[PDB]
Amino acid sequence: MDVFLMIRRHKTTIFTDAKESSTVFELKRIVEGILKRPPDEQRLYKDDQLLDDGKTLGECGFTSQTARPQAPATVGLAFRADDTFEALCIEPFSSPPELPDVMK
Amino acid sequence: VLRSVNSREPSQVIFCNRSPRVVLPVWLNFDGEPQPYPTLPPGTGRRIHSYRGHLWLFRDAGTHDGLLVNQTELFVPSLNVDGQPIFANITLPVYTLKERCLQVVRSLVKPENYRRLDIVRSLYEDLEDHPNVQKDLERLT
Amino acid sequence: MMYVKLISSDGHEFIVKREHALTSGTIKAMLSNEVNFREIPSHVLSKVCMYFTYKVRYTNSSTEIPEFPIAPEIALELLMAANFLDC
Numbered sequence: 001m002d003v004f005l006m007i008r009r010h011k012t013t014i015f016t017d018a019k020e021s022s023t024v025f026e027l028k029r030i031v032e033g034i035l036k037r038p039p040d041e042q043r044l045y046k047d048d049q050l051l052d053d054g055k056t057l058g059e060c061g062f063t064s065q066t067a068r069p070q071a072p073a074t075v076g077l078a079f080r081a082d083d084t085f086e087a088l089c090i091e092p093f094s095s096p097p098e099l100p101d102v103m104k
Numbered sequence: 105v106l107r108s109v110n111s112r113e114p115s116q117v118i119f120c121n122r123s124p125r126v127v128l129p130v131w132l133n134f135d136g137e138p139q140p141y142p143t144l145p146p147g148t149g150r151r152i153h154s155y156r157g158h159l160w161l162f163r164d165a166g167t168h169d170g171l172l173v174n175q176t177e178l179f180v181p182s183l184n185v186d187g188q189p190i191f192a193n194i195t196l197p198v199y200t201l202k203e204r205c206l207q208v209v210r211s212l213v214k215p216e217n218y219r220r221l222d223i224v225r226s227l228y229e230d231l232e233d234h235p236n237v238q239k240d241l242e243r244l245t
Numbered sequence: 246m247m248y249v250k251l252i253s254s255d256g257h258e259f260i261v262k263r264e265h266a267l268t269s270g271t272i273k274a275m276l277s278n279e280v281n282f283r284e285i286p287s288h289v290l291s292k293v294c295m296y297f298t299y300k301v302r303y304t305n306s307s308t309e310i311p312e313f314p315i316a317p318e319i320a321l322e323l324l325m326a327a328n329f330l331d332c
């Protein structure tokens with residue numbers, strides 16, 4: 001079963017899908033092909049939780065009925081610069097303006 | 105042109121609404137006039153009596169947005185095999201993002217206020233030109 | 246796999262499959278691997294990308310199609326974007 005994800009770090013957002021049966025580490029390989037940083041320089045998160053490499057995306061709560069094409073689930077991403085990992089930082093998207101009066 | 109054939113050969117059909125919309129079934133009568141039929145709430149079905157060669161289409165009852173039936177615009181009851189009904193599976197189309205946005209904007213803005221929206225005249229026209237069965241019959245011809 | 250980068254007015258960089266971005270003839274023209282959108286803020290462009298995924302997934306499919314969700318607060322901007330992008 002496919003799960004549909006946004007992998008987010010700072011102001012970077014990757015839209016991609018993966019198998020529910022695929023692993024955290026395999027998702028780092030996906031990130032590696034796109035952003036050119038190896039798995040050992042990546043940390044992946046669900047909310048604040050650090051994800052273990054050997055776990056399936058399914059085991060970590062990314063299921064096909066919650067990580068949907070039109071409402072994908074977010075996987076946080078942190079990089080290691082030199083010796084130590086940065087903290088997890090996800091820049092929020094911009095705020096919609098107020099509803100015009102005629103839409104209220 | 106687009107009209108039911110007066111065949112008089114019964115065909116039993118299941119209208120199965122697999123959309124989240126309230127569905128208006130529309131029968132095209134023998135002169136091509138759209139005749140509305142009772143609505144189906146989301147997820148509900150009705151076993152109905154129709155006829156071979158009759159033409160039907162299906163709309164959102166509140167907005168007239170287009171819906172698909174067995175993945176296409178028109179449904180024509182066929183011969184029943186082994187006394188089994190023909191299934192008419194009614195679903196949402198994959199609307200373009202533009203059409204879906206127009207639907208949502210139409211659902212929040214009274215038609216008198218379309219002009220107060222801060223958009224290009226062509227989008228005001230797109231809002232005012234809401235879905236309508238007559239429009240599509242001309243199109244489908 | 247081939248990706249392209251779509252950049253919002255506020256600097257958010259959205260990385261999506263090339264095939265997905267070609268849903269839009271406008272984006273195709275702008276590419277023919279990064280495009281900047283000076284008028285499309287991230288709360289709109291993120292949704293545009295979600296639409297691509299939705300469309301590619303559910304086009305020519307038998308499985309029941311869910312409604313594509315659009316919050317009232319973004320509908321007007323999303324409409325303008327969809328009109329520009331022709332999608």
Ligand SMILES: Cc1ncsc1-c1ccc(CNC(=O)[C@@H]2C[C@@H](O)CN2C(=O)[C@@H](NC(=O)C2CC2)C(C)(C)C)cc1
Pocket residue numbers: 110111112113119129131141142143144150152153154155158
């Ligand atoms: C209960 C219901 N809910 C949603 S639709 C619906 C419903 C309600 C009633 C019916 C009864 N069937 C009809 O009216 C069929 C459908 C369509 O084929 C036209 N029709 C006819 O019986 C038509 N009759 C014929 O063609 C007879 C000459 C054979 C007339 C009476 C409308 C001229 C069918 C569907």
